[PDB]
Symmetry: C3
């Protein structure tokens, strides 16, 4: 493999993170005050890394930070039950740990932390963060395994109820690439409804990475994946591979969801920057 690969982990990382009420009524996470985003900023670490997140709740209600898949003690649960949320104006240091796969003492195989995970609030609105998740307090986490193929860019599409990334329907989001780009998509589903993410002209493997290890990988290859609340998956694709440039749309394939406007455009450009038809 002559592509860029993820290195071995084991670094202790430090992060500052804020929960912010936005002008439009939404709430979002951010690395800087006044720079909150919906979805929240992407957190990407390697297996074995430890992450210390100094989380400050700038909001006037209790907020928290709860992560999937990663290792964390009960004190970083992010739940009210476990005294792990953050008072308004307060600041709390969460700790997320990751680990490499390996053989246990009993001879069994312990899985690693690698995967496409996500974080979200767990105390806003209800004791399960129904209000915070609805308002936009969610974000992706990528834990890479040593040797994982690294992409040229990573895009996050979050199916939050009847919206993509809390955007108004019929407004995308659209993103761009050039034929041959290695594009990584992180997909998170939140809310109350099930969905089916479909992508025109592209396909991926239904496994951890979206890529096949080789000729022996039995993982099914799909272009349509069913998804439910708190499901997080991701994949990589070669933009326009075998299909060329064009406005390749993606959408939920529940018929009235795509009719509602749960549609976006994966704009793959020719090397001259143009898209067939425009």
């Amino acid at each position: 493999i002559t592509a860029r690969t993820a290195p071995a982990g084991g670094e202790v990382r430090h992060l500052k993170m804020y929960a912010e009420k936005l002008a439009d009524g939404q709430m979002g996470y951010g690395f800087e005050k006044g720079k909150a985003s919906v979805p929240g900023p992407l957190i990407e670490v390697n297996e074995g890394d430890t992450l210390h997140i100094e989380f400050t709740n700038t909001m006037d209600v209790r907020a928290s930070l709860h992560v999937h898949g990663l290792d964390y003690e009960i004190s970083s649960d992010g739940t009210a039950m476990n005294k792990s949320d953050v008072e308004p104006g307060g600041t709390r240091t969460y700790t997320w740990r990751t680990h490499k796969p390996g053989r246990r003492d009993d001879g069994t195989w312990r899985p690693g932390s690698a995967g496409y995970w996500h974080y979200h609030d767990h105390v806003v609105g209800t004791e399960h963060g129904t209000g915070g998740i609805r308002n936009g307090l969610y974000g992706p986490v990528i834990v890479r395994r040593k040797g994982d193929v690294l992409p040229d860019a990573t895009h996050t599409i979050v199916l939050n109820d009847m919206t993509f990334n809390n955007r108004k329907p019929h407004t995308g989001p659209d993103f761009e690439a050039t034929v041959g780009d290695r594009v990584e998509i992180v997909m998170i589903t939140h809310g109350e409804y099930y969905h089916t993410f479909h992508m025109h002209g592209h396909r991926w493997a239904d496994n951890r990475t979206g890529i096949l290890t080789g000729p022996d990988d039995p993982s099914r290859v799909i272009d349509n994946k069913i998804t439910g609340p708190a499901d997080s998956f991701g994949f990589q694709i070669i933009a326009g591979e075998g299909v060329g440039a064009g406005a390749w749309m993606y959408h939920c394939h529940v018929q009235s969801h795509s009719d509602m406007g749960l549609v976006g455009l994966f704009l793959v450009k020719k090397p001259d920057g143009t898209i067939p038809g425009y």
Copy 2:
């Protein structure tokens, strides 16, 4: 393996295909005028084959042909956005390509086109073919990999909203086999609802083919699979294997869906042609 296996692909195939309004108000695809069917005719190719489909829209509304999983340029998208639908009375030549898996230049593994896919309309009713799919404009596509085990027969069951193959509830469809037959089922889900396809007395592997490669295949073995709009899977079973002949029913396992009449019969006969109990 002394069973019939799929050969290597690479042939350029040509197909004529029509979109037809049926007498009962449905719309269906067909290879011959007056011979349209719901679901549409099965298209089965090998990895590496190229398929040229001369599609004629005999209907009085705009129709199109959109396929999953297979390679196609933006001009064969089958969408109105990409000027790829067909005017009433018009004729357009779509091109679907398939490719074998292989090593990329960067050393990564490119997946093949093999799988249980499907095609459907994308412009009737709405810009996502909600009307065409509802009316019956859908059909299965099978792309085989070299060496894939070939069945004795292939049956298509499409869960379109609250119907099997757009049939009236409580009317099947039923199909037959003899104990020992290698039966292939292609399952496509369309519409607005999620379902769970269940089969009495039989089970399959939850992978691309429904079959295990061997003792090292980690794919789970199931008899109940959750499914959503535009999901397409398939499998093969030995009829009556380990269970004998009988009227083995299949149904959606959502309780009121099977109560509604989303039930069919997999009639497996003894070598004398009889079914236990009848």
Copy 3:
């Protein structure tokens, strides 16, 4: 592997089983009269075992016993269509068989019976057991493969409509373990709604066993699994592995389902018996 492993099967087991109307209006299965439970008693066998179940319907309505995944002749279908239910006060002997994986005569690989399966009624209320399943006539079946890692304890959580194990919402069930225990969870979904089972601080492999074979297992590692009616999966976890002791909650992640009270506690204790925070 120095952990306890499942032995080779091939024993002919005999079981007595009752269908009982409970005082609160529910119906449940049991091995002894007056000792019925919801969910029903766990049945655990090895691949190759044969199970003879003398089933007695103590109820005043027709009841039956239908199993998933296991081998059974048409006479043990448990359906009214196949004359396989049990009259009120009647007694019928069902036979479930299991088989090991192996090579077929044609050279193909026949899958084994191993997996996390379940049994339920099929004639109470409707011809699909909608009434019996609702009333609590469901139970887990575990078929082990030779060499499968054996747990310290097994817990069954059944998502029946808007309840866990037909319990009142906000009432668990909760169960306990000590840090380091090998805990097995069997998850069955019944009824009309889809769900997503999520577990704090723990994760498992999305395959047959919930465990990875080793460094070559491509199965995705998850902590959130979408599930529908008659879906049955299971996994094993090391309680508190990498996260420590604490009140680790599990819940459906459909937002108002967890808000409704579809939440339980996986109480992992320190070696001194205490849970952090209490």
